[PDB]
Design an enzyme around this catalytic site. Structure first.
Site, PDB file in Angstrom:
ATOM      1  N   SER A   1       0.864  -1.168   0.000  1.00 48.80           N
ATOM      2  CA  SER A   1       0.000   0.000   0.000  1.00 48.80           C
ATOM      3  C   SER A   1       0.899   1.216   0.000  1.00 48.80           C
ATOM      4  CB  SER A   1      -0.912   0.018   1.235  1.00 48.80           C
ATOM      5  OG  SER A   1      -0.177   0.163   2.443  1.00 48.80           O
TER       6      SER A   1
ATOM      7  N   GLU B   1       0.815   5.897   0.104  1.00 50.46           N
ATOM      8  CA  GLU B   1       0.060   7.099   0.410  1.00 50.46           C
ATOM      9  C   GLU B   1       0.406   8.257  -0.501  1.00 50.46           C
ATOM     10  OE1 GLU B   1      -0.190   7.771   4.615  1.00 50.46           O
ATOM     11  OE2 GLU B   1      -0.202   9.955   4.370  1.00 50.46           O
TER      12      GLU B   1
ATOM     13  N   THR C   1      -3.876  11.324   2.025  1.00 50.85           N
ATOM     14  CA  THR C   1      -3.561  12.201   3.141  1.00 50.85           C
ATOM     15  C   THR C   1      -4.598  13.306   3.233  1.00 50.85           C
ATOM     16  OG1 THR C   1      -1.216  11.784   2.682  1.00 50.85           O
ATOM     17  CG2 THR C   1      -1.732  13.544   4.228  1.00 50.85           C
TER      18      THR C   1
ATOM     19  N   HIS D   1      -7.987   9.428   4.737  1.00 55.89           N
ATOM     20  CA  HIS D   1      -7.528   9.957   6.011  1.00 55.89           C
ATOM     21  C   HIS D   1      -8.498  11.069   6.410  1.00 55.89           C
ATOM     22  CE1 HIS D   1      -4.111   7.623   5.117  1.00 55.89           C
ATOM     23  NE2 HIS D   1      -3.156   8.406   5.588  1.00 55.89           N
TER      24      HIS D   1
ATOM     25  N   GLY E   1      -4.701  14.929  14.002  1.00 52.58           N
ATOM     26  CA  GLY E   1      -4.115  16.013  13.233  1.00 52.58           C
ATOM     27  C   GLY E   1      -3.176  16.773  14.152  1.00 52.58           C
ATOM     28  N   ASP E   2      -2.206  17.488  13.591  1.00 51.83           N
ATOM     29  CA  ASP E   2      -1.263  18.227  14.420  1.00 51.83           C
ATOM     30  C   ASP E   2      -1.785  19.579  14.872  1.00 51.83           C
ATOM     31  OD1 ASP E   2       1.282  16.613  14.651  1.00 51.83           O
ATOM     32  OD2 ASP E   2       1.006  16.585  12.472  1.00 51.83           O
TER      33      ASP E   2
ATOM     34  N   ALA F   1      -8.186  11.358  18.474  1.00 51.31           N
ATOM     35  CA  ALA F   1      -8.546  10.510  17.345  1.00 51.31           C
ATOM     36  C   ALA F   1      -9.553   9.439  17.770  1.00 51.31           C
ATOM     37  CB  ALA F   1      -7.304   9.848  16.772  1.00 51.31           C
TER      38      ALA F   1
ATOM     39  N   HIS G   1       4.626   9.442  20.396  1.00 45.26           N
ATOM     40  CA  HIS G   1       4.120  10.677  19.806  1.00 45.26           C
ATOM     41  C   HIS G   1       4.786  11.817  20.561  1.00 45.26           C
ATOM     42  CE1 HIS G   1       1.555  14.151  19.166  1.00 45.26           C
ATOM     43  NE2 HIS G   1       1.154  13.567  18.052  1.00 45.26           N
TER      44      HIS G   1
ATOM     45  N   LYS H   1      -7.365   3.928  21.937  1.00 45.07           N
ATOM     46  CA  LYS H   1      -7.818   4.244  20.587  1.00 45.07           C
ATOM     47  C   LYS H   1      -8.212   2.955  19.871  1.00 45.07           C
ATOM     48  CE  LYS H   1      -4.697   5.975  17.734  1.00 45.07           C
ATOM     49  NZ  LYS H   1      -3.839   7.086  17.200  1.00 45.07           N
TER      50      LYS H   1
ATOM     51  N   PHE I   1      11.666  15.747   8.197  1.00 42.31           N
ATOM     52  CA  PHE I   1      10.599  14.827   8.577  1.00 42.31           C
ATOM     53  C   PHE I   1      10.831  14.226   9.970  1.00 42.31           C
ATOM     54  CE2 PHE I   1       9.197  14.829   4.122  1.00 42.31           C
ATOM     55  CZ  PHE I   1       7.821  14.780   4.301  1.00 42.31           C
TER      56      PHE I   1
ATOM     57  N   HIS J   1       3.360  -0.142   4.232  1.00 37.69           N
ATOM     58  CA  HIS J   1       2.757   1.103   3.754  1.00 37.69           C
ATOM     59  C   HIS J   1       3.855   2.107   3.391  1.00 37.69           C
ATOM     60  CE1 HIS J   1      -0.565   3.991   3.513  1.00 37.69           C
ATOM     61  NE2 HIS J   1       0.155   4.848   4.214  1.00 37.69           N
TER      62      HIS J   1
HETATM   63  C1  LIG Z   1      -0.004   6.544   9.279  1.00 39.99           C
HETATM   64  C2  LIG Z   1      -0.176   8.026   9.650  1.00 39.99           C
HETATM   65  C3  LIG Z   1      -0.991   8.807   8.834  1.00 39.99           C
HETATM   66  C4  LIG Z   1      -1.216  10.187   9.096  1.00 39.99           C
HETATM   67  N1  LIG Z   1      -2.029  10.899   8.240  1.00 39.99           N
HETATM   68  C5  LIG Z   1      -2.247  12.265   8.520  1.00 39.99           C
HETATM   69  C6  LIG Z   1      -3.066  13.022   7.637  1.00 39.99           C
HETATM   70  O1  LIG Z   1      -3.613  12.560   6.602  1.00 39.99           O
HETATM   71  N2  LIG Z   1      -3.248  14.369   7.974  1.00 39.99           N
HETATM   72  C7  LIG Z   1      -2.679  14.956   9.103  1.00 39.99           C
HETATM   73  O2  LIG Z   1      -2.927  16.182   9.308  1.00 39.99           O
HETATM   74  N3  LIG Z   1      -1.873  14.236   9.936  1.00 39.99           N
HETATM   75  C8  LIG Z   1      -1.677  12.940   9.637  1.00 39.99           C
HETATM   76  N4  LIG Z   1      -0.827  12.185  10.510  1.00 39.99           N
HETATM   77  C9  LIG Z   1      -0.229  12.913  11.660  1.00 39.99           C
HETATM   78  C10 LIG Z   1      -1.047  12.915  12.944  1.00 39.99           C
HETATM   79  O3  LIG Z   1      -2.324  13.551  12.689  1.00 39.99           O
HETATM   80  C11 LIG Z   1      -0.235  13.619  14.041  1.00 39.99           C
HETATM   81  O4  LIG Z   1       0.811  12.733  14.441  1.00 39.99           O
HETATM   82  C12 LIG Z   1      -1.070  14.029  15.259  1.00 39.99           C
HETATM   83  O5  LIG Z   1      -0.308  14.963  16.052  1.00 39.99           O
HETATM   84  C13 LIG Z   1      -1.517  12.846  16.100  1.00 39.99           C
HETATM   85  O6  LIG Z   1      -2.638  12.173  15.466  1.00 39.99           O
HETATM   86  P1  LIG Z   1      -3.236  10.847  16.099  1.00 39.99           P
HETATM   87  O7  LIG Z   1      -4.353  10.409  15.261  1.00 39.99           O
HETATM   88  O8  LIG Z   1      -2.102   9.888  16.305  1.00 39.99           O
HETATM   89  O9  LIG Z   1      -3.700  11.326  17.552  1.00 39.99           O
HETATM   90  P2  LIG Z   1      -4.086  10.696  18.963  1.00 39.99           P
HETATM   91  O10 LIG Z   1      -4.011   9.222  18.973  1.00 39.99           O
HETATM   92  O11 LIG Z   1      -5.382  11.341  19.345  1.00 39.99           O
HETATM   93  O12 LIG Z   1      -2.904  11.223  19.885  1.00 39.99           O
HETATM   94  C14 LIG Z   1      -2.625  12.631  20.101  1.00 39.99           C
HETATM   95  C15 LIG Z   1      -1.891  12.813  21.458  1.00 39.99           C
HETATM   96  O13 LIG Z   1      -2.919  12.733  22.473  1.00 39.99           O
HETATM   97  C16 LIG Z   1      -2.552  11.769  23.456  1.00 39.99           C
HETATM   98  N5  LIG Z   1      -3.809  11.188  23.920  1.00 39.99           N
HETATM   99  C17 LIG Z   1      -4.641  10.318  23.243  1.00 39.99           C
HETATM  100  N6  LIG Z   1      -5.709   9.978  23.933  1.00 39.99           N
HETATM  101  C18 LIG Z   1      -5.581  10.660  25.130  1.00 39.99           C
HETATM  102  C19 LIG Z   1      -6.392  10.733  26.298  1.00 39.99           C
HETATM  103  N7  LIG Z   1      -7.544  10.053  26.400  1.00 39.99           N
HETATM  104  N8  LIG Z   1      -5.981  11.514  27.326  1.00 39.99           N
HETATM  105  C20 LIG Z   1      -4.795  12.214  27.218  1.00 39.99           C
HETATM  106  N9  LIG Z   1      -3.960  12.213  26.159  1.00 39.99           N
HETATM  107  C21 LIG Z   1      -4.413  11.402  25.121  1.00 39.99           C
HETATM  108  C22 LIG Z   1      -1.584  10.828  22.747  1.00 39.99           C
HETATM  109  O14 LIG Z   1      -0.791  10.039  23.640  1.00 39.99           O
HETATM  110  C23 LIG Z   1      -0.833  11.746  21.821  1.00 39.99           C
HETATM  111  O15 LIG Z   1       0.332  12.298  22.389  1.00 39.99           O
HETATM  112  C24 LIG Z   1      -0.581  10.798  10.254  1.00 39.99           C
HETATM  113  C25 LIG Z   1       0.237   9.992  11.052  1.00 39.99           C
HETATM  114  C26 LIG Z   1       0.465   8.603  10.781  1.00 39.99           C
HETATM  115  C27 LIG Z   1       1.375   7.828  11.712  1.00 39.99           C
END
Ligand SMILES: Cc1cc2nc3c(=O)[nH]c(=O)nc-3n(C[C@H](O)[C@H](O)[C@H](O)COP(=O)(O)OP(=O)(O)OC[C@H]3O[C@@H](n4cnc5c(N)ncnc54)[C@H](O)[C@@H]3O)c2cc1C
Length: 292
Positions: free
Chosen positions: A16, A18, A49, A77, A108-109, A127, A153, A169, A220, A270
């Site tokens: 796969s 992206e 993405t 995504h 998302g960041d 997420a 993270h 999650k 990166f 991936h």
């Molecule tokens: C395969 C992959 C694809 C991606 N695709 C995109 C994309 O298309 N667009 C984009 O903008 N970004 C993308 N990203 C980046 C990602 O959105 C960033 O890394 C973002 O900062 C974290 O997203 P997440 O979904 O992992 O968040 P989460 O899993 O929500 O984590 C965010 C932070 O919150 C913490 N956290 C989670 N749950 C809790 C809780 N209940 N209480 C307290 N803290 C908690 C975590 O430990 C972490 O530090 C991608 C990353 C990967 C690995």
């Protein structure tokens, strides 16, 4: 065409990759060529993405629809950052309404220039909340994946917390996960075991980014918190002004990583292509694959 089913009934490791929706015609033209070249290697699914904070959501929908007509299986995504819960739910519906059966639920960041995440005044914060939404509204009608971080993270308070949050999650309803890019397979195998120990049993696919430029690697890793092996770093730095030498170094390194992952029995790999085909195609060919 659910990834959940593709993994369970696979005849071998799934390929796969992206890509991101371009912001110009030149970008679209380049992406079309990349899709044509990589499609020849039979990808099980193709990630689209999602622009930061929904900035290009309409483009994501456009491409999710477009690649299907090209015979590709879309993994759309979707992040919750900078968007109201309502906006998120709306785009989510447009994806499903467009035939999308695979979603990668993400947070998302934070906005540029900010190191600590803050949600939309009326949006989700994690997420996991999007995973729950997807399940509550569509059940198993779609397959959902999430991001995993072998090296943690950047915002996690500790690695233990990082893993607990990932497990939470998964528990929200994930069928699989894709990891952040890594350059030493030990990072991946170690995370896999930490996960299994924590009771996580879903397939966790390794995300790989073959390096094509020294700057690319440095930037990166600096942003995602990933590490660079000392040997690779020294080699790339020494040959940074030679595009050809760098491509060779990056491809060989990725080939070495992927070869061991496949032999280790991973369910798939991936590839982060950044909309370019050369590096990924060279890795696949050096592994012995040939265009259909
Ligand atoms: C395969 C992959 C694809 C991606 N695709 C995109 C994309 O298309 N667009 C984009 O903008 N970004 C993308 N990203 C980046 C990602 O959105 C960033 O890394 C973002 O900062 C974290 O997203 P997440 O979904 O992992 O968040 P989460 O899993 O929500 O984590 C965010 C932070 O919150 C913490 N956290 C989670 N749950 C809790 C809780 N209940 N209480 C307290 N803290 C908690 C975590 O430990 C972490 O530090 C991608 C990353 C990967 C690995």
């Amino acid at each position: 065409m659910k990834i959940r089913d593709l993994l369970k009934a696979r005849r071998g490791p799934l390929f796969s990759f992206e890509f991101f929706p371009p912001k110009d015609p030149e970008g679209e033209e380049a992406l079309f060529r990349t899709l044509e070249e990589l499609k020849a290697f039979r990808p099980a699914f193709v990630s689209i993405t999602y622009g930061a904070m929904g900035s290009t959501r309409e483009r994501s929908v456009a491409w999710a629809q477009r690649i299907q007509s090209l015979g590709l299986n879309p993994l759309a995504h979707l992040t919750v950052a900078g968007q109201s819960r309502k906006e998120v739910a709306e785009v989510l519906h447009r994806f499903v309404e467009s035939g999308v059966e695979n979603l990668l639920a993400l947070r998302g960041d934070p906005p540029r220039g900010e190191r600590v995440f803050r949600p939309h005044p009326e949006g989700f914060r994690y997420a996991a909340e999007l995973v729950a939404l997807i399940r509550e509204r569509y059940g198993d009608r779609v397959s959902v994946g999430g991001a995993a971080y072998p090296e943690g993270h950047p915002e996690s308070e500790s690695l233990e917390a990082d893993l607990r949050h990932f497990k939470a999650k998964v528990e929200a309803g994930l069928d699989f996960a894709i990891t952040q890019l890594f350059f030493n397979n030990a990072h991946y195998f170690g995370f896999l075991e930490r996960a299994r120990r924590a009771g996580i049993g879903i397939p966790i696919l390794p995300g790989i980014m073959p390096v094509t430029s020294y700057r690319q690697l440095r930037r990166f890793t600096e942003v995602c918190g990933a590490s660079i092996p000392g040997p690779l770093l020294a080699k790339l730095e020494r040959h940074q002004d030679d595009p050809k030498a760098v491509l060779e170094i990056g491809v060989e390194h990725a080939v070495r990583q992927v070869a061991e992952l496949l032999e280790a029995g991973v369910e798939g790999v991936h590839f982060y292509t950044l909309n370019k085909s050369p590096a990924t195609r060279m890795v696949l060919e050096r592994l012995g694959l040939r265009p259909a």
